[PDB]
Design a binder for these strands. Structure first.
Ligand SMILES: [Zn+2]
Lengths: 71, 157, 137, 139, 139, 49, 62, 97
RNA sequence: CUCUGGCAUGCUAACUAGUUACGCGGCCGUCGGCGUAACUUCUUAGAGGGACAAGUGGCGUUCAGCCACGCGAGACUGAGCAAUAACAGGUCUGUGAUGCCCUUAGAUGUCCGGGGCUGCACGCGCGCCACAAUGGGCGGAUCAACGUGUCCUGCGCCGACAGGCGCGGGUAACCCGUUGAACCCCGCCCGUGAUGGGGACCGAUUGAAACUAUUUCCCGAG
């Protein structure tokens, strides 16, 4: 269905599946984790500081993140 | 001496589809103009550029190649090769240019209807249409329309 | 002030006005919407401190601006319902109180020609804040 | 020491001034890096990206544009400063240096030096705009 | 701190009206009749509540303060023009009506003109509209 | 008596030629009928271009 | 079953069809010039262009 | 000190007035300023062609060209009455200040 | 032919349009801050220059011309005007253009009061606004052309805002006005859910006579 907040059971599931995706954007995390968009954008700010994802370009319409140090 | 990318030794395999050379050694202009359509997006070129600029990012990060080499590969493999007219039905070859015109029209329309009834960003669906149209992934919209127009052309001839 | 981002300047200038609590910040700051063409209240609580930052910045570009000329800056496309939308000016009171808030500080002054201009002290602090934000990056 | 040329797309006229400065261009006191739109930034850098950063290091450019819209001005000032350097090299330097910089600009885009005489056509009664007409009702 | 709390209730029955715990603190109370989007963002600002929360994040302590400002807003310096009912026909005091109150409040005006047999009153009885406009083709 | 105040609204302005209250042209100070201004358009100085 | 053959237009004969949408031209192969066939073309085509005909067997009857 | 304006509708009559005004002042050897050209003001009247209703929605858009030409002179007004008295021209209007 | 659009560090011009120097003041180069010297590129508009299928090539009895291509502000753009003959097309309701007929004091003349022209089971046509994913919502920040003005507005003050109270300019390239328009741009919010998309229908003003809510303003419903 839909979820506005985050659940502790699915909390750890995000740290192991989102950094593994090639395209990391709230439009993709929303479809795969049933996140209602707003929580998806704020979740990437938490992942950005922890070092799991890195920012390549940030815009008011669409933000893109990549896999952190995978080469 | 370099444009938005390096594009070292751009390869155009087919000789017939060798018309868009304005950015090679402009297709980037025509792809931005063909996206602003369907009424409520007319007269917004800068809006489509941000969609294309974000599309090149998704293409460059998903494939280890130049972003332009996926755009040309999409229109060169999704371009039609036979149409059916009203002869009063023969498989008519289109053009070296009509293949470029109709393929881009199918790419913009593909990400349009697939993102209207779904919650997806246009900048993502455009990049998704290019990777699906290349090599004929059998799941895109341009390939599904190309194979359909070629199947009906062979039947009524 | 032109060598820096005008959005980053108004954001850095908004903190300077809130740091020194010598402004007016009236009581009705959080009940009124900023214009009749808008529908809801602003999202930021301290919109008055940001509006006063952009208001004093426009005086640097061109002086002699009053209340009737500031509401023309802060105008939008008013959704008239089923009627085609049009341009509608902002509110004169929220713009007058901002101009009066800058009068409490030694940043703006009333010129005899009409409207409001900047003071030798107003341009002093306006350029240093633009200078410290230029050295940021 | 005195070069003033206008660059117009539709109605916006941009008078570019080319003086013996130090090589730091700025639009009427504002640097060309903070002019909206942010995407239409390379268009101002075209006379400085494909052209080497050694001919503009001896001139100062301060332009003033009036009229048109946002896109009508970003295309106006890039043409204003392009025709500015070609006029300075004509009045005081040899044409071999001037003709060399003209071929490199036109080879990239023709609208960088040649002005576009296109204007908006007048509206004709019977419909919105010039060509389009109101819907006709049969029977 | 985005983890869901244990006190997160999806439905908070307030004034015999259900409140979904999915939207923000303002747009959730809009479902209650008599309180719209404009009246929600005000009563939540006078109560010093974080606007970046959801309806399920406010416990019973925060809810009672929000409803208290909703009932009698004149005691919290909320102006009279912002109210729904300003000068009642039978009460005559500035009091913003609520969900279960407006159904009885609006029907009094419909019955007052019906009992008094006014031209504006008979139209509500005939099943027609009290027209400020034409009704030739609009069904 | 026998004088009703008419200075604001349709009924105080009329064509200065045919005394009509339809198709008035009162911009720039003409106050003429639309079917009568064309008759004197060449005399006033208005030409078609 | 025949392979997809490429063909270069050597001379355009003019616009044909019912509504004038097709352009009957004569093509010329690049690998082997031992075959010449006329084919209708639907779309703007310059001189010397290359089309990709599939059947390469049936004619158009002018 | 005096600003002479020339209000005319037809350019042929306007250019002839400003010609003799400069020559009419040249004989007194006065430091006169060149004639300036004010923006031409046209008056648009978009009238329906049909007298009443029946037609094909045809509008005839009239225009009225109003030209203005200024000539600035700094000279005493003692004997300028006769200078303007020899500037008679139908269709034009001179308003000295 | 007329009109309009098009491009000379060109000519003719400019304190009701400016620009470049200089002085002065503010600020850490910036300044539509101020003041007078040069100038007419930018602005305004006067005349005359320019563009003809003139050069290149091809095709065509070689003509008429067409196609392609140098050089170029154009290989040109839109508009106005537009025959002969005709129509039982529209207009007696635009005329103090008008034939005939009718009415003419208890008037079909016109002055005033009231209502209707807006009245609805429905049909049609021209449009508006939407059914949002390319959007909506709140900030900030950059931009104008034909216009209009006795009535448009400027500034202070008051006001949730519509407005209201005061002080001025503009009969106009002068004031409004460097037309600080929306779309677009830069952040944030919302997340496909008739929702924050869409809005029908349902006390505070303003010019009068708010009945039949002229319309606006706020809140709610929607
Ligand atoms: Zn008349």
């Amino acid at each position: 269905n839909n979820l506005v907040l985050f659940d502790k059971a699915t909390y750890d599931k995000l740290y192991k599946e989102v950094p593994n995706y090639k395209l990391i954007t709230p439009a993709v995390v929303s479809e795969r984790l049933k996140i209602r968009g707003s929580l998806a954008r704020a979740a990437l700010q938490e992942l950005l500081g922890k070092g799991l994802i890195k920012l390549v370009s940030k815009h008011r319409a669409q933000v893109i993140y990549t896999r952190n140090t995978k080469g | 001496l370099f444009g938005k990318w390096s594009t070292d030794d751009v390869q155009i395999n087919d000789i017939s589809l060798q018309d868009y050379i304005a950015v090679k050694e402009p297709i980037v202009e025509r792809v931005t103009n063909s996206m602003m359509m369907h009424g409520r997006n007319n007269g917004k070129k800068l809006l489509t550029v941000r969609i294309v600029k974000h599309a090149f990012e998704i293409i460059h990060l998903l494939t280890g190649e130049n972003p332009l080499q996926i755009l040309v590969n999409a229109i060169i493999n999704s371009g039609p090769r036979e149409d059916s007219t009203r002869i009063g039905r023969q498989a008519v070859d289109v053009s070296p240019l009509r293949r470029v015109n109709q393929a881009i029209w199918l790419l913009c329309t593909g990400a349009r209807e697939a993102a209207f009834r779904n919650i997806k960003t246009i900048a993502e669906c455009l990049a998704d249409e290019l990777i699906n149209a290349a090599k004929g992934s059998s799941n895109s919209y341009a390939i599904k329309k190309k194979d359909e127009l070629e199947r009906v052309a062979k039947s009524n001839r | 002030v032109k060598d820096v981002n005008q959005q980053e300047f108004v954001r850095a200038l908004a903190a300077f006005l809130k740091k020194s609590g010598k402004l007016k910040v009236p009581d009705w700051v959080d009940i009124v919407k900023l214009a009749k063409h808008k529908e809801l209240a602003p999202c930021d609580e301290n919109w008055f401190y940001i509006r006063a930052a952009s208001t004093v910045r426009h005086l640097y570009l061109r002086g002699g601006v009053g209340v009737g000329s500031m509401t023309k800056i802060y105008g939008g496309r008013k959704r008239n319902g089923v009627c085609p939308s049009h341009f509608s000016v902002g509110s004169k009171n929220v713009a007058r109180k901002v101009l009066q808030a800058l009068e409490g500080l030694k940043m703006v002054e009333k010129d005899p020609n009409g409207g409001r201009r900047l003071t030798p002290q107003g341009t002093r602090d306006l350029d240093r804040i633009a200078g410290q934000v230029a050295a940021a990056s | 020491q005195s070069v003033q040329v206008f660059g117009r797309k539709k109605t916006a006229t941009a008078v570019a001034h080319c003086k013996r400065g130090n090589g730091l261009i700025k639009v009427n006191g504002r640097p060309l890096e903070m002019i909206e739109p942010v995407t239409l930034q390379y268009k101002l850098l075209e006379p400085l990206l494909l052209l080497g950063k050694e001919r503009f290091a001896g001139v100062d450019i301060r332009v003033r544009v009036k009229g048109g819209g946002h896109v009508a001005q970003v295309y106006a000032i890039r043409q204003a400063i392009s025709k500015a350097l070609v006029a300075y090299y004509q009045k005081y330097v040899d044409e071999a240096s001037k003709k060399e910089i003209k071929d490199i600009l036109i080879q990239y885009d023709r609208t960088l030096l040649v002005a576009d005489p296109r204007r908006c056509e007048s509206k004709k009664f019977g419909g919105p705009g010039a060509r389009a007409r109101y819907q006709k009702s049969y029977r | 701190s985005l983890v869901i709390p244990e006190k997160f209730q999806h439905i908070l029955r307030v004034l015999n009206t259900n409140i979904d715990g999915r939207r923000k603190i303002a747009f959730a109370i809009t479902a209650i009749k008599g309180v719209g989007r404009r009246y929600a963002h005000v009563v939540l600002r006078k109560a010093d509540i974080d606007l970046n929360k959801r309806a399920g994040e406010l416990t019973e302590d925060e809810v009672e303060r929000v409803v208290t400002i909703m009932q009698n807003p004149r005691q919290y310096k909320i102006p009279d023009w912002f109210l729904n009912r300003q000068k009642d026909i039978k009460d005559g005091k500035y009091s913003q009506v609520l969900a279960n109150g407006l159904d009885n409040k609006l029907r009094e005006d419909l019955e007052r003109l019906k009992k008094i047999r006014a031209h504006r009153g008979l139209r509500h009885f005939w099943g027609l509209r009290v027209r400020g406009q034409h009704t030739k083709t609009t069904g | 008596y026998w004088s009703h105040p008419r200075k604001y609204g349709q009924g105080s302005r009329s064509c200065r030629v045919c005394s009509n209250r339809h198709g008035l042209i009162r911009k720039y100070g003409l106050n003429m009928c639309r079917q009568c201004f064309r008759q004197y358009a060449k005399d006033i100085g208005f030409v078609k271009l | 079953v025949q392979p997809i053959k490429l063909a270069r237009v050597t001379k355009v004969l003019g616009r044909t069809g019912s509504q004038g949408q097709c352009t009957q031209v004569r093509v010329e192969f690049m690998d082997d010039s031992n075959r010449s066939i006329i084919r209708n073309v639907k779309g703007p085509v310059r001189e010397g262009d290359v089309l990709t005909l599939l059947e390469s067997e049936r004619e158009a009857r002018r | 000190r005096i600003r002479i304006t020339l209000t005319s509708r037809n350019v042929k009559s306007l250019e002839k007035v400003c010609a003799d005004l400069i020559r009419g002042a040249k004989e007194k050897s006065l430091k006169v300023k060149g004639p300036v050209r004010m923006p031409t003001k046209t008056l648009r009247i978009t009238t329906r062609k049909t007298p009443c209703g029946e037609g094909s929605k045809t509008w005839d858009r009239f225009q009225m060209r109003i030209h203005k030409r200024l000539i600035d002179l700094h000279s005493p007004s003692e004997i300028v009455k006769q200078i303007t008295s020899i500037s008679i021209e139908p269709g034009v209007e001179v308003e000295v200040t």
